[PDB]
Structures are given as structure tokens and as C-alpha cells.
Amino acid sequence: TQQPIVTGTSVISMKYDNGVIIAADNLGSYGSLLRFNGVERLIPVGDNTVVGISGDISDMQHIERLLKDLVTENAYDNPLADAEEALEPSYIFEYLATVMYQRRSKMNPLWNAIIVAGVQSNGDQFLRYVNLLGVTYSSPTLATGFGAHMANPLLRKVVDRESDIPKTTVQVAEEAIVNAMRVLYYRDARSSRNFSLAIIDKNTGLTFKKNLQVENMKWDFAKDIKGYGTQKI
Amino acid sequence: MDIILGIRVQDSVILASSKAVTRGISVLKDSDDKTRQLSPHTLMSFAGEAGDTVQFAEYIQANIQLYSIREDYELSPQAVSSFVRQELAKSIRSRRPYQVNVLIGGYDKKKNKPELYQIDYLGTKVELPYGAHGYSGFYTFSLLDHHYRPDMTTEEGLDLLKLCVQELEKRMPMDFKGVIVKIVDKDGIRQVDDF
Amino acid sequence: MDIILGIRVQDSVILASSKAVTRGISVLKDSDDKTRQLSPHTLMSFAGEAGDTVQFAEYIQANIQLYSIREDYELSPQAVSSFVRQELAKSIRSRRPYQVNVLIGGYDKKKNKPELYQIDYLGTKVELPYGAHGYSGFYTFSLLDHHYRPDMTTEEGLDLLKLCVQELEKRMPMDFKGVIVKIVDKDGIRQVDDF
Amino acid sequence: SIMAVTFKDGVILGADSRTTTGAYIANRVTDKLTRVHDKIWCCRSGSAADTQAIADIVQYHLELYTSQYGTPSTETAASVFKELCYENKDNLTAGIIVAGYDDKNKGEVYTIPLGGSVHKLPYAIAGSGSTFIYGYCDKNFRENMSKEETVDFIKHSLSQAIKWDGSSGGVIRMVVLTAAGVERLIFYPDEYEQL
Amino acid sequence: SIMAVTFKDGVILGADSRTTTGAYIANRVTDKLTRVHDKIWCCRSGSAADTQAIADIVQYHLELYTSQYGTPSTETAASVFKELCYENKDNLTAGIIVAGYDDKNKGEVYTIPLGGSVHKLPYAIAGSGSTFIYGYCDKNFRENMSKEETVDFIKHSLSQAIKWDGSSGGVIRMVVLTAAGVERLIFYPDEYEQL
Amino acid sequence: XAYX
Amino acid sequence: XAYX
Amino acid sequence: XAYX
Amino acid sequence: XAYX
Amino acid sequence: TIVGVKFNNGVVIAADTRSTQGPIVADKNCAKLHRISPKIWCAGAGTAADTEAVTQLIGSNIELHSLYTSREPRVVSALQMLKQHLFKYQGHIGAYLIVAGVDPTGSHLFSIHAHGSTDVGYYLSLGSGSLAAMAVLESHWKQDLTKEEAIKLASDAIQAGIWNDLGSGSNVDVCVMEIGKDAEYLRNYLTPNVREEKQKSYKFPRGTTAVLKESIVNICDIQEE
Amino acid sequence: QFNPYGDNGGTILGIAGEDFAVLAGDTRNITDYSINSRYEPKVFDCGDNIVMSANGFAADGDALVKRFKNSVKWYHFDHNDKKLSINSAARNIQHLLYGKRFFPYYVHTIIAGLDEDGKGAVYSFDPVGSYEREQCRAGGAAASLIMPFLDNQVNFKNQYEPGTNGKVKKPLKYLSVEEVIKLVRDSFTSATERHIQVGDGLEILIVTKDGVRKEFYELKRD
Amino acid sequence: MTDRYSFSLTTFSPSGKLGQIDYALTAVKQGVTSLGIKATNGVVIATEKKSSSPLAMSETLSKVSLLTPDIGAVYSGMGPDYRVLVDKSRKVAHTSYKRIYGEYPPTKLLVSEVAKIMQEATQSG
Amino acid sequence: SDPSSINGGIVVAMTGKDCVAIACDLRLGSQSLGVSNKFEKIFHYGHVFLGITGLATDVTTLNEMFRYKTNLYKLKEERAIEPETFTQLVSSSLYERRFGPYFVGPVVAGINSKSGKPFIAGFDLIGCIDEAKDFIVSGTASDQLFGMCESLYEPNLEPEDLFETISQALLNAADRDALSGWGAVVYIIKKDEVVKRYLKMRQD
Amino acid sequence: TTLAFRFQGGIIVAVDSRATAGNWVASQTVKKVIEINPFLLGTMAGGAADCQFWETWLGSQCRLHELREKERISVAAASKILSNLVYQYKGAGLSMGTMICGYTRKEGPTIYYVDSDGTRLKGDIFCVVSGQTFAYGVLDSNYKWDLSVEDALYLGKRSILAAAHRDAYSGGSVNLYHVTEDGWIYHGNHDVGELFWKVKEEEGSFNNVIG
Ligand SMILES: [Mg+2]
Q: Among J81, K118, M172, N209, which is least packed by CB within 10 angstroms?
């Protein structure tokens, strides 16, 4: 049993017609202090899976090493390591889910919320969540921390149910994710303007975008605001 | 802990009250009368926190006696019970509430009927054929549920109460040093010596 | 709470033990024997936490009975008491200590002398002319300080113990449902029916 | 993140625009610079409710002062703030910087921490984000700076405070207090972030 | 107040010399810069006992590494620190900056906060006094500075940290790590205070 | 709660 | 404890 | 209690 | 849990 | 979920119609839009009794002030009187209000927290669904909104709350306060959560319930003759 | 401190017919006031014509269902592919639950199937493995809303024969699958209105001699 | 200081008259004429706007006052006394009724409350 | 310890076609111990009916208080108080004890004598008003009553039908609550007649 | 509410059938008597799981005894297996109040009360009303040693009804058992709802009610 020290905020994600998108800001907070502004919280596993992690960054770096070690071990005595016996998103998720629930049950949890985005062998979109309690759930849109409260409402207006996934293009899905990251920059005190975004498509594969910035921000209306009520000057 | 029982028969109300006063692992007295005569045809038994019990009973006694002198009239048991309830209902939201549970046994001369009232320290009032306060409560309720009848005589009422006390002496784990029994009928309030 | 008394007279040891077993405001039993025969001339009375009392007494009984069979010899009361003390002295620093107070009444056949030992759950042992555990303790100590003599007969010892129990029944605020009395002399261990 | 800086022509007040309820930004365009008199302004840090309540009372006191004794000094304004903050220190969480322009005393800055103590300073910083710019502000502050120099000093200072403090953010608001009158400046993220 | 800064020719470690037990200065000339290998040093913040215990183990691990596999990388040293800090995070209060010079990798700085996370940075600051110089250091740090420039940057930075932080003070110690070797610098109050 |  |  |  |  | 949105010629406030007691829905159609004055309305979140009580008290004192001054009441007056009351009680009166209205000064939109802090905005949200609502407002708000656009944005922000928040539910209540016009109160503006027909009628056959006794109750007064 | 438990809400309902059984649950997964998923199944086919649902803390529920599923697999291996009877499954689950007696699974478990006489069976467990066979059981957040309704409408409680005045009870009768599914749908529709953690969707698993089949119905999403 | 007039200024004279009430009525007699008429479907109250000066804006002085949305008042006698009674009447309509029952008081009960305020000025110290 | 579940009990009110029904159990207990099975929780001031659940001392106190207030109302107004007005009086009276409240769950039922419109309302302990068209529930088995009412109820039930629905709603809710039962009363209220029925129910 | 009392005709065992989760009635149809073997019964009070699990486990241990010693275990031995087990778990929070009732040639009719506290007591009558355990019946007035079997069954049935009425956490139905030489006999399940009205009308008791 511990308390989290250096932390990462919201990870947000959604399914679209041909794959999945996931995003996370590049900040490691130390309480109210925005200490590290160069932290990558999307960790790709092969060319078909991205793991987005929020919470304690020390525990994130541990999980990063487990996944790096998982790829190494899968290759051992495996002639089809880069083909039919490659790591699937569903394999990578179930492993983490097992670890997370075991660690909570020994009262020494990995203080994280994890979203595993990827595409399976048969081209099926994979998107599932697990956290420090070992609680798991899947949905057309998933988000951790503040994202759950602010991102999901916006992403659910694009994909409300399972039938809206085929009508959702990558152009539309990415636009929704990018807009959600701006909203989070506006209302999240532990957010960052700098973020990373990963698209896993069943046709074009894995596209990993770094050093993205929130842009087209509305602040101009602020100049017209004076005092808390009765001031007019 | 203190036994206070009440049974309303055909033509009277009988109140049995435990004789022992205990503070911790010490027996302060073995002949205590946990009762006050409010009016000639109204009797109140009381159990609860030390001092509070007597202080409350004597305060109620004084107010009812004052009403009697001023109007040259006896308040009905229903009226006396309502007054007592309202005094307890005030106290719960006061700085230091009276921690007193009371039984009020009365004979209404206007209606020629005996009446028993159970009131807890919160000011919770009910009219009952039989009542009790404390650990003894549950046992006496189950026993009287069986044996009690509305048309019972005073003598039948005493035998059933005698059985309750006998059974409580075995079953209860504290020595309550016997009970004092008092009957309230049209002729007034008398104490049964043989028990 | 449980009464366990011990009085060592001229030629015997007498152990009075309360018959009631109570959990909270419930009387589980009214005829409980809070004693085990350790050996033919050694008797142990016990009072304390539920389960612990019997579990400890039966464990001690088994170990003394084993020694008897192995050596075809009876351990002296001094030896049995020292064993019991050492078992309790171990338990206090254990994960869950035995919360048991014991009196050990024995007749030493070698010295032709009766011996009474008082041991608390900490393993505090003393040889006494008379002993007691619990709330009854202080009262019985003051009373026996007055009336007790070393050269008292078994009959004199019983009368003085009869007076203690009588006095405890009035003074104590809990119903301990009478006592079981057992005498330990050269002829062995017998139970006094009339008490 | 709030600061007041004296320069040659008067004083400048600077603040961020972020109000937080936990880690949620309740208001991202807050006006933390409040008028208590024509040329006496204050910066508010701590409880939004407490600082508003105080600011509202001070504005009342100085309006009534003006009616009777004419324009109050910046020192007078600071004293009224102190009186409220010191006497109600047990119930208040308010850190207030008072800044004002007289023609006689020119630019003056008073800081009032939690205690309700008063400190007259050439410049003052306060709020959660102030801790990160103590080093910067001390190294870079000169006396009798120009308006342009002082605006740059505040812009750079709060730019750093906003960068490191999660509780600080949004736009940088400034209020210039000189003989010329009262000027309101705003600087948006795209401007101050790239500094 | 501790910092490590990468420059063109290698890395420089800087620290104050103040050890506090509450508000008492236990040691005013502490050496907070500790050698784990010839050209791998660390800065220690947090528990003096915990950081020494960790530093002593790391020095052991790297000595044994050198015997078997030759000179370890700065990255390797940082990893050993992390392993101890992360796995024992529940029992440790240690904030360690690791700085080292390879010929291949030149100057490298790794910071390890409480969590036991690792961060590779151009420069790093830590300790109680670091909070006051976040603004200053960010504005004034450039990459590929000269030795003289980097010494000035650290001297000015810690000078401010010492000024504002009560827990920081005494002399400024520095250790220069280049191809040329290992240089120890000391700067006394009379020098750095007047900056 | 609201609270620079 | 001793504890920059 | 009742509590949007 | 359930508990006569 | 309660929102306020400023537009070109006035202000609009909206709210959901759910009240909760723990996890249970106490009221499926409840009115959170309170009339302080004819053209000053405010939305309430927090302790249900406290929001009603504090708006009725200030609404009463505002009416007396309007009669005394012979002037239509101002939002800043209601705002000042609310914040001074809530501050006095140090948050123990758990009222979180969005106060809007039009007066001779113009159109105004304010929020007021239970501890007595107030703020100004073109778009505000309060309650458990505030983050769902603010997400929609932050995404879709612009300067110089029309009336039709402001109602749409307001009800969209409430819907976000209704769907994504367990605290918010049922219908959307709107009130439009336009300058130089009567405030229009649109009760149940949207009804997105209408319950579907049951599979079965549970209407029992008469005489199903076992009756001990029957009697007439006398509700009438003591009679004549 | 670190709290190892959470509440994911939802509600489950088991009804036993004469030659069938149904286990129904909402598809909503919540945390505090936030919705995690509108469709995350909670009722599972475990093989041998047994359907299971552990409702409460989702993590503990997922763990228990996994362990029981694994228990069914090893029953086949160790006992020559013998079919696990519902009474045997029930006893096995008691031992799974009681295993963690001093660190419990915070779940209410219902299993449905057919008894060895081919009659519909529902078994109900507490968190620490106390179990009992029943005709009716609702578990989870909205159990208090639904159970009284089932007492009235399945067991015909407090219902008497008209014209007797409480002298003769309404006769107990086995409900058809079509009647049972109506009660399940109306139960959940009602629970959805008045419970904030119930809604989004309803998934019903029906067990007959023929096997396990699945029905889904939409619920209000507020 | 302190209000040391704790005694009645209105007392019974040997004839049984209350002087100050009679003298108050004499003040009412001197006052400008006002009237009220009740129709089947309404009530009308009217009075003359006796302007003190033609420079005075007689619109600013309201002799006919709204007490509640459904209750109006007009007077004859001393205007200032009327103005403070209207203020007290409007307030008591809220404090003693609307804040309790959530509706405006009926005419007869608001009259009863105004009457009470004027009786007290007849007996109080 | 929790005041609103010491004595126990339940009240439920329903609207029908030109009628309202209010019903309550008869239990008063000290937690597990049942004391009285004659403790009625429904009172009437003229044609306005008030049911009160919660701490029994406050049930009795508020009954006495509302009898007091409605008696003075009638003397001054020269007419019986209406349900809508009485609802506002209950709310007022409860909120004036905001920081020291009565631990009760009141329920108002009645027909407006002038408009003839059926009216029900519920309150929280600080006087917040729940004015539902369909039904109001209160007490230790409120969850149970919400479940029963939400499935059993349909609008515009005739008086003799409405009786069966409210009766089955109470009886089945009470049997799933330890602190409720020991008999039940049902009031069927029409514009100018009121029938009161005691129900046979299990006594445990 | 569990009752087990001894008389000339053997042992009467009466229990209610209500399970409670706080003030919530979980079930009205729970078996609170475990049939360990044809001559052994166990009553259940306290934790539903603790009783069910360990008294089922006791049945296994009692069966193993019969296989290794070719004889039914004595009530004394069976009671002590359970008492020695719970004592190992003492302080862990096991909640259990059980009466082990049986007949053997050796002992005759025997009732042992076993407690999660580790208490083990022999007695002629044991009762569990509310959360308290008594050495006397819930009425005790009607008790005589020489009672008719079908008269004794009534006292047991009536005694559970008495407690079921007053106690909020007791009710559902009464389950009756008669233990004799050559095993126990089930005497049916009696719904308290129906039983109460029948008993009232026939006995002329519960006058404080009305119906
Ligand atoms: Mg910031």
C-alpha cells in the first residue's frame, strides 16, 4: 500500500470504422507542480497495440519494462513471432489485467489506469480498460481520470452505440479526440498542451504522432470579463 | 439494570418496579421505590440515568399537584401522560436531556376505565394493555402476549405479573433484589405487601 | 462476573466456584462446574474469558495425567502449581494469551499438608491461607482476614465459606446462581451437596 | 499567481485567471484584480469566498471614508484590509496584496499574508505559483523601472509561475495605476508561453 | 538545494552544505555530493540515513560491475539507484540526482524523485530549496554552455535557493566531471551572497 | 470550495 | 532525524 | 435530505 | 454477509 | 446539471428534472428553475431544500426592495443578497446557483457557490453534470450567439449531463430572458426519457387484498340539529 | 489509505420455471456518478447448462466467474467428462467464496440451470459463500426494488381468492417462459426509473434441456 | 439617551374618550377626500392628487399603493404616516403569510395585520 | 443510532380517477423489539390527510403542531386549509428547523375542495417538496415501495381498483422490511366521502 | 430464533427461517437445521456462511469417525470437533451459535451448545432469541418433563411464534424436528403468517393484536 507521487492525467480513446485512436498529454505532475514536460505515456507493443497509462509514473515505467520483456519472451523459440504467433492486443491486455488484480489482492497495487488500444489478427477493433483495482470494462469510447468526466461525453456524441462504429471515419474520430484534448487543457489543472496521439488502423497499420499541440483556443472573450459581479471598470 | 413492568387488567393498572439501585459493581440500595403518585388515581414508575429519574418524577409530580390545587380537579391519565410526553419531547433537543423512561398507570374516573402509558426518554408514547422498559422488556412482552386477556381480574393480573418476575429472576443475569407492586383502581393507589 | 474462592484449613482445602455462565445480558447456564481434577489430590478452579478457561484447564489436566501415567507417581501441589504458572507466564508474551485466572487446591501426601495457590493470567503465583479472583475478591479477603484461623476444621471452613457466599449474594450486583463447593484432603476430592 | 510592482510613474498589479475546485478549473478567465477605490486596487489569493467578502467590506469602508474625509491613502486601505484579516484570522484564508497611486506618495505596495501582518515592499508576490518565481523576481527586479520594463517583468514572472504551478493558468491580467489614470492589460497564452 | 547541469565538456554537480534536525543546523559544512564511480557522482536530498545507505549499496554494485564488465554507463548507475528507490519506496525518503561523464555519451543527468521513477534531463534540480529557482533556472539554462558559464549558472541558482530556503545554506560545493578528470569547487557565503 |  |  |  |  | 448561456439580446438558463436521495431517484420531474423576480431566474444545484429556500427568501426581499425603490429589480441585487446570506452560513446552506436575468442595466449571467464566492461568464455550468455540460459548452460556444443557437447549446449541455451523469436525468427545463421582452419559462422543453409501455397490466381482481375492518371517516365539521 | 474494493452497481435477476430457468442482468457498468460501459455483460454461460452472475465489485465478480469456469474444466478432466449438476456447482461455488472468507469477494452470486430431475433451478449466494435454492432472487443495487415485486407476482404473496376475504390464498402456479420474460422486463424497466445505477440495456440468458439461448432489450440511458 | 418614554401617551379621559385617537380622526377629517366602490366584477379606489407646488412632479408622489398583486390601498390624512404604513403592510404580507403559506394573504387578513400595527401605536409606550 | 430507523414504519400515497389513497403500517419498535401494533402514522386536518414516517416522538410532535396551525388557520381564514396550501405550511415548518431538523418523512394527500383535482406530495426532513402525479413513498422500506409502486401503478384507477394496487404495494414492501408491518391501514379518499380499511397481514 | 429442549419423549428442536442483511429481509425460507446423520441435528445462529460451511464440514468429520471406528460419533465428540475447530479461529470474527442435538446408546438424548467464542456447554434446554443465548425457553411456563410428543412439538412451535412476532429479525416459517432412539423425524414447515392467525383463534392469545 502506497500513495502516488509523480502522476499522469487523462488517457482518452475511441473505436472508428477501420481501427482505434488513443491519446495522452506528455506531462508528469508532482502534485500541483508541473515537473516533467517530456513524458511519453503511450507505449506501443509491436505494430498492432498501443498501451495508454495514467497514474503513478514509476509504476508506469515498471509496466513499460514488463511489456518490453513480454515481446522478448514471445520471440523465444517462436519462428512465427513476426506473423501468426505475434502478440495480440487481447493477449497484452489479459496479462496486465492479471498483474493489476494480483497486485491489488496483495494490497500493493500498481497505482494506474490502463487503456489497451489495438487491432486483432482478424481486423477486429480492440479497446479495453483496467485500473489499480483490476476492474475491467470495454466500450466504443474509453477515458481515465478527468477524461471519463469530460472526454467521454464528447466522444459518445460521435459513437453512442456499437452500430455507430462503421459510420465513423478516421478523419471524424481524430477530430473528436483532438477537440477532447483541448477541452481537457481548458478544465484540467494537471493537463498539458503537448500530447501524443496513436492511430492503429487494420489497413494503414500503426501511426504514432509526437509533439502535437492544442491549437484554435478561444481566450478573446476574457478581455470583456471584469470582477466577480458588481465591478464595471 | 432496572425492571419496570405495567399490566392493565379489566378494572385496574398494576405496576411492578425493581427494588435495587446499582452504580457499577455496587448495590447502593435493595428497597428503592421507583414510583411517584402524580394524583390520587395516577401513578408513574421510572427507570434511567441516576438523579435524572427522581429529579424528573418529582418535577412532574409538583406540576400535576399544582394543576389539582388551582382547578380543584384531577387531570385524566390521558392528559397527565400527554403533559409528561411533551416535557420529555422538549428535553431531547435541550443542552442535557433527561435520560428517563416512565410508565404511567391511571384510573380515569370520567370513563371508569384503567389506562397504561409507556413513554421513553425521547417522548415516544403508546397506550398498551401491558408495557415494560429495559432488557426484561422483550421477555415479558412474549410471555404476556401468551397469557394476558383484556377481561382479567386484579388477582389474575397479579398472578401473571408474579410469573413474569419469577421467570425474570431466573433468566436475567443481574440481581434486581425483587419488585414493589402497586395497584391503581377507582378506590385509588395501594401497595401489595405479599410478593 | 464469576466467583472463585479458596480456603486452606488445618487438614484440607475447600474451593467454592459460581455456577453461572453469562454472555452479556444472557444466562447461558446455571449449573456450571468451573473445576478440573488435575490429579487424585489436586483440584484447579478457573474463571476468565470464554473458551480460554476450559481449553486451558483441560490442557493442564492432560499434561498432569500424562506425568502420572509415565512416572506412576502423583506430582506435589507445589510442582503442579509451578507447571501451571510457567504455562500462563509463556502465554502473556504469546500471539493470543490465555485470559484465565486459576486457584489450585491440593493435599501433599509427602508433607501431609493442605496447600492453596492463587495464579492470575499473567503467571503471578502466591501460596495463601485463603484466596479469590474477581470483584468478590476484596470483600472475601476483608471478611476472612477477621474470621479465618490456621487451626480451623473442615466443618468450620465450610461455615466461614457459607457466610462469604451469603454475604456476596447480598453485596454483589450480579446473580451468580449459587456455588459448587469441593473439599481436597488426604482421602482425595469430594463435592459437598448441601450448600 | 499574483504580484504588484512599483515603478517610476506608479504601480502595476498582475494576476493569472485560473479558479480551481480541487483539480477542476471552475473558471479559466477569473478577474483576481479588484477595485476598492479609483486608484487603490488589490490582488486576491486564498479562499475566493473570503477574499470577496473582505474586498466587498473594504470597498464599503473606503466609500464611506471618501464621503467624510476625502480620498484615502494606500496605507489607510492596507490598514482596513489588515484589521479584517487579523481580527478574523481564525475563520479566514485570505492572502491579499494592496497596491495604490497617490500624487504625494506615488506608487505603494502592501502585502497581507495569512496571519494578518502588513509589509510595505517595493514589489510583492503571493499565491501558490509565487514560490516558483522568488528566485527569478529577486534577480530581475530593479527600482524606478519604466512602464514597458515593469509590464515585461510581470509578464515574464507570471509566465513562469503559470508554467510550473497547476493551480495557476489562463490569461495574465494587469492593471496600471499612474497619474494618467487606470489602464487594463490582458496577455493570452500564445503570447506569454513562447517567452 | 542540489542540481546537476550538462555543458559542452561534460557535467557539473552543485549542492549546499546544510543538514537540519528540525530548525537546528546539525552540520553547516555537509558534503551532499557523493562518488559512486570515478566519473559517476550523485546529489542526495531527503533522509540523510536513507540516501547514505542507498549511495553505499550503489557504490558496492558498481565496484562489482567494474571487476566483471568494466566501467559502467551513467544510465547503468541511474538504473541501480532506481531499483533500490522503487522496490523500497514504502520505507525510503530519498530524492537523488545521478550525473556522470562517458567519452561516448559525454555528460548525462538522471533525476530520481520519491516514487523511484527515472528522468533523463539536460539539467536537474531537487531538494526543498529547488522550488524557489524553477522560474530562474528555466529562463537562464542554455544547452552546450562553457565551464565558466555553467559554474556561474549553478552559483547564481543555488545562491537564490539558499537565500529563500531556511533548510538550505552554508557553502556551495560543486564537482566538475569532464575528460580532463574530476575538479572540486567551493564558494563561501561572502562570495555568493553579494551576487 | 473555489480557490493563484 | 537529519535531512537541501 | 434530497439533492444535477 | 447474511445472518434468528 | 444546470447551465447558463449569454446570447446577443439576453441570457438562457437550463436544468435537468432529477432529484436523488442516495442512489434512488426521489423525483423524476422536478423544477430546478426558480423565479427570484419576473425577469430574474436562477438554476439551483446542491441541497434541494436549500436552493428553493434561499431563492424564495431573496425573491421575497427583492420584491419588497422593488416596491420600496419603485424600480424593476437588478440581477446584481439578487446576486449581492444571495452571496452575503450564503457567506454568513459558511457553506452550511448547500446552495450552488446560476443567477441570470435582464434589468434596466442589460442582460447578466452569474454563478454563486455555497460558501458565497461569485463569478461572471458568457457560459456557466454547476452540479454533478457540470463537467459533461462544460465539455459541450467549451466545444460549441462562440461570441455573438443568436437566441435559437443559445437555447440549442443550453439544452445540448443539459443532455450531455442527463446521458453521461447518474446524478442528472429525465427532461430539460429552459428559461429565456431577452431584453425588452417577457421571460418565457419552457417547462419540459425536451422529453428524451419517456418510459416504454409495460408488458403486463398489474391491475388486481377486486377482493384480492384481505380486509380486517372497514369504517367511514368524518372529515366534515360538527353538524346542526 | 488504499481501498481494495469498489462498487460497479448493476442488478441481476434469477427466475426458475418448471422445465426452464432465466438469469437476467443490466449491461451498465458504473463507478461513482460516471458510466464505464453501456454494454459490459455480467451473466455468463459456464458450460454444462449452468449460467452464472457475480454482481457488486466487477473485479471480484470477473475473478469468481473465471475460477468457477476453471472449476468446471477440471471437473471434466478429473471425473471422465461427467456433467456438473447445479447442486454440485452450487456447493463448489460455496467453497470458492468461503476460501476468501477473511478477504471476501464483494459480489452477490446467482446461478441458474436445470436440476437432475430436469426442473428449473436458481441458487443464491452471499459474499462469504452462504447459499440456498430458490424460485426467485434479485441481487445487486436494485434488489430491494425488484424482490418485493417477485414475491407478489411469482410466488403470489399477499394475494387471496376474490370473495373469500383472505380465507384462501391464490393458488401457486408455474409461470411460462413468455410470462417470466415479461416480469423480468417490467422488473428492470421499473428498477431503471428509480435506481441511477440501473439502465442502458438488459441481457437475459434462458436455460432449457435444448441448451442456453440469449435475449437483449434496451433500457433508458439517463 | 435611551427611549425613557416606556408609558402610554394615549390614555382614557374621565368621559371615557381616548383623546389622541379622536385628535388623529380630526387630522383625517382635514385630509383630502378619497373613496372606494365595490362592483360585482371588481373594486375601484380614487383620490385627488393635491399638488403642494406646480413645480412639484405629482406623478412621483403615489397616494394609491399596491400592497400585493391583488390588494391596493388609498388614504386620507397625513401622507408620511401612510407611506411607512404601506412599507410595513407590504413586509407583514410576506413575513406573517407568504413566507409560511407560499401564497399572498386574503384581503381581510392583511387588513387585520395593518389594523394590529395601528392599534399598537394607540397603546404602546 | 440513525434517528429515522429506530422506530421504523412506512407510508405510501397514490392518485386515481377523481380520488387519492394513502396507507401506512401500524408498527412502533425499539429497533428489533416490537412495542405497539396500534401506532397509526396517518392524521387528517379537515379533508387534508398527512402521513408521517421516522422518529415516533417527532411524528407525534408534528401531528400536534399541524393540528395547532390548521386550527388557527381555520379560525382566521373561516375555511378548511387545502392540500396545496398545507404542503407549503409543512415545508415552511420543517425548513425553520434546518440545522436541528425533525427526523420525519411526511406525505400529504387530499382532493382540492374547489377544483376537485387529486393531490399528493412528499417531503425530505428539511422540507424540500416532491409533488409527483403518480405516487409518493416514505419510510424504512422506501426502496421496496418505489419498486412495488413503479411496476403495479397505472394512471386513472377507479377507487375500488386503486385500493387493491396501494394495498398490495404496501403489504409486499412491508414483508421485505424487518422494521415495518404488524398491521396496515388504507384510506380511500373521494371528494365528499372517505373509507378507512385495516388489512390482514403476517404479524412478524 | 433457535430452540432445542429435552423431555421424557426425547429432544424437540424448533427454528425460524428468516435471514437478514441489516434491516433488509434477505430470505423467509432458510433451513436453520443441518441433518448431520439420522441421529444428529445442528441448529444455526449467527453468520449464515460460518454455520452452513462448518456444520457441513462437521458432517464430513462425523462420517470419517464412523468409517474408522465402525460406530456413530457421540454427541459429546461431534460437538467438541466443532468447538475445537472454531477455537483455532477465535478472534478472527467467526459468528456462530449452534446446538448439536442427537441420541446415542452411550449418552441418551444430549444437547451441546457450541459458540464461536469457544464456549461448549451441555444442557437440558438451550434457546437463541435476538442476539442472546439462554438456558431457558422463550416462554418456560408451559414446560414439564413428562410432556406428550405432539404436546411438546406445540411448545417448540409456539415458542418460535412468540419470538417471531416480537423480534423483527425472527419470522418466515417454523421448522420442527423430533429426535429419538432410531433417529430424528421432520415435523414439517409452518408459515408464521398462517400459524399466527390459527394460534390466536384457537388459543385466545395475542389479544394486543386485533383481527
Ligand atoms: Mg498551468
A: K118
Question: Is B138 in contact with B167 (CB distance < 8 Å)?
Answer: no
Q: Please work out, in degrees rounded to the nearest 5, the angle formed at the alpha carbon of residue N32 by the alpha carbons of N28 and N38.
A: 135
Nearest to A167 by CA among A179, A177, A176, A158: A158
Chains that touch H (3 or more CB pairs under 8 A): J, M
Nine cell digits for residue B25: 459493581
- Measured CA distances, E44 to A35, E100, E163, G4 (Å): 18, 15, 20, 8
CA distance M151 to K194: 11
DSSP per residue, chain J: -EEEEEETTEEEEEEE--EEETTEEEESS---EEEEETTEEEEEEESHHHHHHHHHHHHHHHHHHHHHHTS---HHHHHHHHHHHHHHTTT-S-EEEEEEEEETTEEEEEEE-TTS-EEE-SEEEESTTHHHHHHHHHHH--SS--HHHHHHHHHHHHHHHHHHBSS--S-EEEEEEETTSPPEEEEEEE---PPPPPSS--PPPTT-S-EEEEEE---S-PPP-
With beta carbons under 8 A apart, name residues in chain J contacting L90: 64, 67-68
* Residue spans of alpha helices (H) in chain A: 57-75, 89-105, 146-155, 170-187
CB contact set of E112 (below 8 Å; sequence gap of 6+): E78, E81, E82, E85, E94, E95, E96, E97, E98, E118, E119
d(CA C93, CA C122): 9
CA of D20, closest CA in chain E: separation in Å?
A: 21
Cα M52 from Cα C75, distance rounded (Å): 74
Nearest CA-CA distance, residue F1 and chain J, Å: 7
Query: What is the distance between the alpha carbons of residues A181 and A194, in angstroms, rounded to a whole number?
Result: 10
**Gap from J119 CA to chain A (nearest CA, Å):** 4
User: Hey, what CATH topology would domain K1-222 get?
Assistant: Glutamine Phosphoribosylpyrophosphate, subunit 1, domain 1 (3.60.20)
Q: Do K47 and K212 contact (CB within 8 A), yes or no?
A: no
Contact pairs from chain D to chain F, CB under 8 Å: 30
Give the CATH architecture of domain C1-195. Answer: 4-Layer Sandwich (3.60)
Residues of A with catalytic function:
1
CATH of the domain at A89: 3.60.20.10
Among residues B47, B21, B55, B182, the alpha carbon closest in space to that of B120 is found at B47
Q: Does M35 contact H at CB distance below 8 Å?
A: no
Which stretch of DSSP H or E encloses residue B117? strand B113-119
**Between the CA of residue L89 and those of G2, J62, M92, what are the distances in Å?**
74, 16, 21
Q: What residues does each domain of chain C span?
A: 1-195
Q: What class does CATH assign to M1-204?
A: alpha beta
Angstrom resolution of this structure = 2.9
Note whether K touches A: 3 CB pairs or more under 8 A: yes
Cα–Cα distance, D139 to E156 (Å, whole number) = 9
3-class secondary structure, N93? coil
**Domain range annotation of chain K:** 1-222
- Give the start-to-end residue ranges of the domains of chain M: 1-204
Return the number of other C-beta atoms located less than 10 Å from residue J51's C-beta.
Answer: 26
Identity at C137, one-letter amino acid code: G
Residues of chain N with Cβ-Cβ distance to B146 below 8 Å are 139, 141, 158, 162, 203, 205
J105 touches chain A (CB under 8 A): no
Q: Strand, coil or helix: what is B157?
A: helix
Q: In total, how many domains does chain A have?
A: 1
Q: Locate the DSSP E strands across chain N.
A: 2-7, 10-15, 19-21, 24-27, 33-37, 40-43, 97-104, 108-115, 120-122, 125-129, 132-134, 173-180, 183-191
Closest alpha carbon within chain I to N18 = I4
Q: How far apart are CA D111 and CA D4, in angstroms?
A: 9
Q: Are D28 and D18 in contact, with CB atoms under 8 Å apart?
A: yes
